[PDB]
Design a protein around this ligand. Structure first.
Ligand SMILES: NC(=O)c1ccc[n+]([C@@H]2O[C@H](COP(=O)([O-])OP(=O)(O)OC[C@H]3O[C@@H](n4cnc5c(N)ncnc54)[C@H](O)[C@@H]3O)[C@@H](O)[C@H]2O)c1
Ligand SMILES: NC(=O)c1ccc[n+]([C@@H]2O[C@H](COP(=O)([O-])OP(=O)(O)OC[C@H]3O[C@@H](n4cnc5c(N)ncnc54)[C@H](O)[C@@H]3O)[C@@H](O)[C@H]2O)c1
Lengths: 231, 50, 148
């Protein structure tokens, strides 16, 4: 756009639920600024630019940013896995995370939020490895009927939250969205299963109707015979 | 690495699916036979009562 | 439209059953304004613009807004699920929600309404995951006869 005035104090407005790191290379002093405060640089201070991960399969180096948002957000990833029956199928997951900053006045705790410079790619490949590893020993039918408990046990442990203690990033939930087979033949084979289930249900109602018809028929026949003997 | 290997595993997964459909069809057949025999037994007892 | 006068006090009329968040970057003081009050900015205050979710399959980043409405509204979502018989079938649901603000004078409680900057996409994917997970172990006939 228009050029900036190089002689003016370079400054930046940190949003709500966010932080920046800035080190004074001259006076030899770091500081992490929290909250919605406005940050103004000294003559030799610099920002810590975060190279993050983004995209639909979560590629790395896809979103460079300047401040760190530590709120209850979520990010969603697409995981291709394979089961013990060798069923290749891909997932869509959703990861509720936030940062647990116990003290914002601690210079050593708050430094650890920037200890891991790609907090999204790390957690997403970690949960991908965990889910991929646990489902690989589970058959296809058990996974299809119980895939909530399988993945909720694969991500967490023996636990409600998945804390990552290098930076304080907890993961409080996982939300599976779409589980479908990669192979089209697999889906076509499952369509025959659902049409057989429907045919089974119609055969069951026809058999119940036939047995009710036979009961009423025999009851009427018995009353007719007793009436003929009375006549 | 080998494509033939993956193609051989596709036959394994389609056999697993065929096994699952055969299992549900057998369970449905046995439930049908149980209800059929129960109705037949009630019908015979009712014919003797008539 | 016509340009605004940059020298006039920038102001906004918050509706009934709504709130805005506004932080004074100079004097270092936040405030959440409730009710139908008229909000006027100081010389260094700013608004918190909410990027929300909208649409028919509830896509994200579809409705940017400025104030937060916390009334008994509803939003409707379309959920494609699949049962234990592998019956793929899609739903249309409707979600009566409101915000429970116990004290409007509390600076810590009322800050939490903006703690989650996309309250629609979060709740809709959460209920989508729950419904999708519970129906996946239920056969098609039981679901059709008892889906309420
Ligand atoms: N509580 C909630 O449900 C909630 C709250 C706020 C936002 N959201 C939205 O949910 C969407 C999920 O979409 P997605 O994750 O598939 O898109 P994506 O994968 O492109 O998003 C990448 C993630 O990185 C996070 N991020 C980006 N810049 C950041 C920074 N400077 N500091 C810290 N974190 C940063 C975002 O929160 C986002 O979830 C997000 O785009 C987000 O805006 C949800
Ligand atoms: N009690 C009621 O039944 C009631 C009351 C008011 C409105 N409504 C209407 O019901 C409709 C449902 O349609 P939909 O949800 O499928 O359309 P949609 O999915 O496009 O609506 C998105 C939802 O976000 C909410 N929203 C939008 N801007 C907001 C803000 N600034 N703060 C807080 N919430 C905000 C709306 O209430 C709406 O329900 C809404 O459009 C709404 O106007 C119902």
């Amino acid at each position: 756009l228009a050029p900036r005035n190089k002689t003016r104090v370079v400054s930046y407005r940190v949003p709500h639920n966010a932080a920046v790191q800035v080190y004074d290379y001259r006076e030899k002093r770091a500081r992490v600024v929290f909250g919605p405060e406005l940050v103004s640089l000294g003559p030799e201070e610099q920002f810590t630019v975060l190279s993050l991960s983004a995209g639909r399969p979560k590629r790395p180096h896809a979103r460079r940013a300047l401040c760190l948002l530590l709120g209850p957000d979520f990010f969603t990833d697409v995981i291709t896995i394979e089961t013990a029956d060798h069923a290749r199928l891909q997932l869509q997951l959703a990861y509720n995370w936030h940062f647990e900053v116990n003290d914002r006045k601690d210079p050593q705790e708050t430094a650890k939020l920037f200890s891991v410079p790609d907090f999204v790619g790390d957690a997403c490949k970690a949960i991908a490895s965990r889910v991929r590893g646990a489902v690989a020993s589970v058959t296809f039918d058990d996974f299809h009927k119980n895939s909530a408990r399988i993945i909720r046990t694969a991500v967490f442990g023996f636990r409600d939250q998945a804390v990552f203690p290098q930076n304080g990033l907890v993961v409080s939930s996982v939300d599976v969205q779409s589980v479908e087979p990669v192979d089209q033949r697999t889906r076509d084979a499952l369509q025959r299963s659902v049409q057989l289930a429907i045919e089974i249900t119609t055969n069951s109602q026809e058999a119940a109707a036939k047995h009710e018809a036979q009961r009423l028929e025999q009851e009427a026949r018995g009353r007719l015979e007793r009436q003929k003997i009375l006549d």
